[PDB]
Design a protein around this ligand. Structure first.
Ligand SMILES: [Mg+2]
Ligand SMILES: [Mg+2]
Ligand SMILES: [Mg+2]
Ligand SMILES: [Mg+2]
Lengths: 66, 52, 31, 181, 461, 50, 32, 107, 61
């Protein structure tokens, strides 16, 4: 059945390919996940609020400018 | 020996073996060519073992 | 494969004498 | 790194040296004595003629067995030879000294080989197999070369056909540069 | 090649460059330059552009960051680089393989953004997105083009500064993330006031909560409105953003580590990681640009052959003008199926329509990834050549079998990375998270990079 | 020869593994004096005798 | 091709922010 | 008129007279190359593989007495070489050598 | 979760053997990771699990 095996077989291989890859990946551990949690969190606070600060200080200037 | 190797491979990985060939390498290590039963896909089993 | 191809390529290669330094790496440009 | 002589006016000089060069010491001593005192362009042209056998290096001290040639009569001598390896080793050293002059901003076309010196380097040990089950030394005789080039008042430009050559690119040089870069 | 590499020649000889650092710069010196560099960019992100009054509208420029010296943003530089590597990767553009030709090549890729800087600006001026050039004239256009030129010009050197060891990582990545992080915190602590028929109230979700919790007698109503604004940020949209953040962090670290070693030295064991998001965010980005213009293109098409069932069946279009501004929505057909839901209930109303979109959105990014690799120059063969160029090799393998071992994962990590890229992006779009699934990945990735450098320096800092 | 004993083939293998250059990190040890493996062997220059 | 030190960038970049500051300030107050 | 082509007869017999058997055909190739510099004044002489085949057609010692050759001075296409021109030497089979002058050939 | 010999003293023989088997399985999985590109963290774990196994066997003996 060309019409069936033509595009079904690549998709069935595709599903079995992802599992073969996924069971090969070095998935981060819970301990590593926790490490990336704090690191990202502290970083996001660092970038989020300092970039936040520049915007608030520019407000009083911007209201005067316009 | 080939009997022990067959019993080891089956028990460790819960697979079936068709035959075991063995050579002792020039560096002194023994290499086992373990052929699995036809219903066992060696590429699949290798993924389980982490070989690939 | 036709055996006269051996002669044809040999003579073609013998024509590189006039084009030294710009010999085309592959004549079969397609692909 | 101490040279045997101090330049007379250091700001007007350029240095160059090499160590453990695998070029015969006796041949290179004679070759250096030929170009000593020459203007850099004249010296460069002369060692390119030694390569092509159009000018001989007189062998004056280390001359045991050396043959006679018609070109040796230029130097008031009967014995001469055409050491190609010594000529080429000394050209590479001249090129390096020439570059060092350029880096210091000297007038390269006014340079003269004021000082040049060939020293024996530690010999390298091979062997050769003699009759009656004997073994004998097979010594290479390398040398240290050091030169000093100085500005003088005679100016000689580079030949026209010489500066017209392409700056040859080195594929193998690129390959190593990729690895580091 | 001949009429492109040499055309750059005259101009790159005059354009400036940043100097090599003599020695390896101190980290606490790196931090100083970075913080300075980031601060300046941030300042550019707020300063209003000079002389823009007609249209983008002025009141929004008071609110906004649209209209700032970053108005054209880092986009020209990113688009400049992608277009180069896109053509270069495909072999369409030939890159001089020497470092000096590479140093010029850098200037060429720099040159594009400077070209793109003027090109993108011209589009916005003539169309009235700042205002008619007749209203502004040459002088006002002169300054606006110059300012839009200098900001990207500054942005370029500042990134090149960090790229060359005067700081940490690269500016562009730092810059795009800082925007992402700021948007998230702003939308939680924004003191903006919204003038409603219910009164005046604050915008920032955290700020709005305590402002409402005291301002409303119905404290359950605060529990409802505060977390379920349908035109304003909600604590949910914060919670939706936070939840995605963790999952991306989990799948950020996915990678298949292949063993490799130097073919020139014993031991020295290392590894080449095939990252699951092998294609970065490019696949979905290209997919989104396709979908958006397919909506625009159909709009103009369907107004000329609407009576033909095929053009209608292709995709219908209407004009929603009830109250708010006339916004163009699809009415049916393929484009209708290629659209995401705008409300949760809408997914329930039509079960088929939702699955049709998702298969398109998972298939498109996955298919984009698979096709992107070959063109982008990241396929196994290209990867193997890079490893061969670096004199690396898989132990026990010949140089050819490397390609066989790389194709085990790279072609699949391509598609599944794209499918994973889309799927998480559906959650970002569906659950109202801020910045789309593209944005969070960008943010998490960048912060991860600086973190792992940061810890290494902390080893002796 | 091809015809080998187990004892001989095993003794040969140990000679095979000893015949390698030193790790380069050994140079960076605190009191280290070794510059190279001075016990290298070549199958032609010097023979094992067994 | 000029090779640039970070200070030049900071000095150039710093004064550019200074310039637009006057232009925004001057544009209004002197036209007020 | 740098690019030019002429047809010559070379008296190989008198060029290799008195040479040893195992060097007779190697030396003819040398005397043909030396002839080329003299006629065209070009260090870069390139001897065609047919002319080499013709010179060796009778072994190493019974080399042909006369050989008709064509010299064509051409522009050296590579600018890396120091030589602007080179000479190409091709074989010209002739049923006879009697009365053959040195001829100008015009393409 | 380190195998300290003080935590094994009272345990029963079948319990300790089970604990031993987990360590023997954990090691063979690491020995695979040694040749298939295991992280430097996993290479350093081998000695930790070789000695853990020896600790269990000592207490059993
Ligand atoms: Mg004597
Ligand atoms: Mg004698
Ligand atoms: Mg003997
Ligand atoms: Mg022997």
């Amino acid at each position: 059945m060309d019409q069936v095996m033509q595009f079904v077989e690549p998709s069935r291989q595709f599903v079995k390919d992802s599992i073969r890859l996924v069971k090969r990946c070095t998935k981060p551990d819970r301990k590593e996940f926790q490490k990336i949690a704090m690191a990202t969190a502290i970083g996001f606070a660092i970038m989020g609020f300092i970039g936040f600060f520049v915007k608030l200080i520019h407000i009083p200037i911007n209201n005067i400018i316009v | 020996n080939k009997h022990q190797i067959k019993q080891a491979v089956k028990k460790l990985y819960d697979i079936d073996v068709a035959k075991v060939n063995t050579l002792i390498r020039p560096d002194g290590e023994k290499k086992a060519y373990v052929r699995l039963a036809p219903d066992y896909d060696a590429l699949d089993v290798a993924n389980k073992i982490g070989i690939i | 494969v036709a055996k006269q191809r051996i002669r044809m390529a040999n003579e073609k290669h013998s024509k590189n004498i006039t084009q030294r330094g710009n010999v085309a790496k592959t004549s079969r440009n397609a692909p | 790194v101490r040279y045997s002589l101090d330049p007379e006016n250091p700001t007007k000089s350029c240095k160059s040296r090499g160590s453990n060069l695998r070029v015969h010491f006796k041949n290179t001593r004679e070759t250096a004595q030929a170009i000593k005192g020459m203007h850099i362009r004249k010296a460069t042209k002369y060692l390119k003629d030694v390569t092509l056998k159009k000018q001989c290096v007189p062998f004056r001290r280390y001359n045991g067995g050396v043959g006679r040639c018609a070109q040796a009569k230029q130097w008031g001598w009967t014995q001469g030879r055409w050491p190609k390896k010594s000529a080429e080793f000394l050209l590479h050293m001249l090129k390096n000294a020439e570059s060092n002059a350029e880096l210091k901003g000297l007038d390269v076309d006014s340079l003269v080989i004021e000082h040049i010196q060939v020293n024996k380097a530690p010999k390298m040990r091979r062997r050769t197999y003699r009759a009656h089950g004997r073994i004998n030394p097979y010594m290479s005789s390398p040398c240290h070369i050091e030169m000093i080039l100085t500005e003088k008042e005679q100016i000689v430009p580079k030949p026209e056909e010489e500066v017209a050559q392409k700056k040859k690119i080195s594929q193998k040089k690129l390959k190593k540069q990729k690895l580091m870069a | 090649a001949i009429k492109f590499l040499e055309v750059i020649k005259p101009f790159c000889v005059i354009l400036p460059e940043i100097q090599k650092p003599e020695r390896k710069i101190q980290f606490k010196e790196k931090v100083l330059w970075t913080a300075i560099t980031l601060f300046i960019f941030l300042v550019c992100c707020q300063i209003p552009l000079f002389g823009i009054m007609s249209s983008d509208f002025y009141w929004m420029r008071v609110i906004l960051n649209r209209g700032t010296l970053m108005e054209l943003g880092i986009s020209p530089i990113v688009t400049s680089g992608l277009i180069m590597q896109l053509l270069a990767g495909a072999k369409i553009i030939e890159v001089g393989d020497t470092p000096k030709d590479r140093a010029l090549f850098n200037g060429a890729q720099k040159l594009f953004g400077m070209i793109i800087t003027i090109g993108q600006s011209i589009v916005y001026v003539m169309t009235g997105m700042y205002g008619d050039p007749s209203e502004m004239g040459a002088g006002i256009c002169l300054l606006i083009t110059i300012q839009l030129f200098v900001a990207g010009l500054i942005v370029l050197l500042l990134d090149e500064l960090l790229q060359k060891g005067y700081g940490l990582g690269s500016g562009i990545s730092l810059f795009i993330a800082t925007n992402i992080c700021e948007t998230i915190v702003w939308k939680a602590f924004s003191p903006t006031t919204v003038n409603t028929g219910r009164g005046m109230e604050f915008e920032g979700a955290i700020i709005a909560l305590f402002h409402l919790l005291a301002t409303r007698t119905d404290k359950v109503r605060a529990l409802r409105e505060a977390f379920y604004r349908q035109n304003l940020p909600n604590l949910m949209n914060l919670i939706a953003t936070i939840f995605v953040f963790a999952v991306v962090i989990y799948f950020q670290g996915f990678r298949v580590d292949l063993p490799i070693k130097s073919a020139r030295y014993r031991g020295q064991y290392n590894t080449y990681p095939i990252k699951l998001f092998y294609t970065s965010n490019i696949p979905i980005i290209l997919q989104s640009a396709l979908v958006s213009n397919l909506y625009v293109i159909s709009q103009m098409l369907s107004a000329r052959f609407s009576g033909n069932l095929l053009v209608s069946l292709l995709g219908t279009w209407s004009d929603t003008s009830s109250g708010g501004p006339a916004r163009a929505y699809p009415v049916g057909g393929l484009c209708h199926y290629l659209s995401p839901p705008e409300s949760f209930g809408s997914v329930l109303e039509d079960p088929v329509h939702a699955v049709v979109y998702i298969v398109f959105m998972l298939g498109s990014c996955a298919f984009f990834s698979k096709t992107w690799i070959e063109v982008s120059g990241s396929s196994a063969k290209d990867v193997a050549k890079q490893l061969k160029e670096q004199q690396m090799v898989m132990r026990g393998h010949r140089e050819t079998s490397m390609v066989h071992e790389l194709n085990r994962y790279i072609p699949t990590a391509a598609a599944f990375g794209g499918l994973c890229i889309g799927a998480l992006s559906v959650l970002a779009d569906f659950l109202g998270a801020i910045g789309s699934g593209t944005g969070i990945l960008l943010a998490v990735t960048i912060i991860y990079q600086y973190f792992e450098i940061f810890v290494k320096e902390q080893s002796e800092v | 020869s091809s015809h080998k004993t187990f004892r001989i083939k095993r003794f040969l293998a140990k000679k095979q593994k000893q015949n390698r250059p030193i790790p380069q990190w050994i140079w960076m040890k605190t009191g280290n004096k070794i510059r190279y493996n001075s016990k290298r062997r070549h199958w032609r220059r010097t023979k094992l005798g067994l | 091709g000029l090779k640039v030190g970070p200070v030049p960038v900071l000095v150039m970049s710093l004064l550019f922010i200074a310039s637009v500051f006057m232009l925004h300030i001057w544009g209004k107050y002197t036209r007020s | 008129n740098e690019v030019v082509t002429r047809e010559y007869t070379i008296n190989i017999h008198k060029r290799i007279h008195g040479v040893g058997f195992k060097k007779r055909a190697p030396r003819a190739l040398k005397e043909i190359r030396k002839f080329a510099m003299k006629e065209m004044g070009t260090p870069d002489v390139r001897i065609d593989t047919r002319l080499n085949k013709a010179v060796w057609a009778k072994g190493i010692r019974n080399v042909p007495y006369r050989i008709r050759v064509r010299l064509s001075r051409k522009r050296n296409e590579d600018e890396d070489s120091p030589n602007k021109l080179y000479t190409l030497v091709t074989y010209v089979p002739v049923t006879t050598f009697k009365n053959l002058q040195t001829v100008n050939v015009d393409e | 979760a380190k195998i300290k010999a003080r935590d094994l003293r009272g345990k029963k023989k079948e319990e300790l053997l089970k604990q031993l088997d987990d360590l023997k399985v954990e090691l063979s999985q690491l020995r695979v990771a040694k040749v298939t590109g295991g992280a430097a963290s996993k290479l350093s774990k081998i000695r930790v699990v070789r000695k853990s196994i020896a600790r269990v066997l000592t207490v059993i003996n």
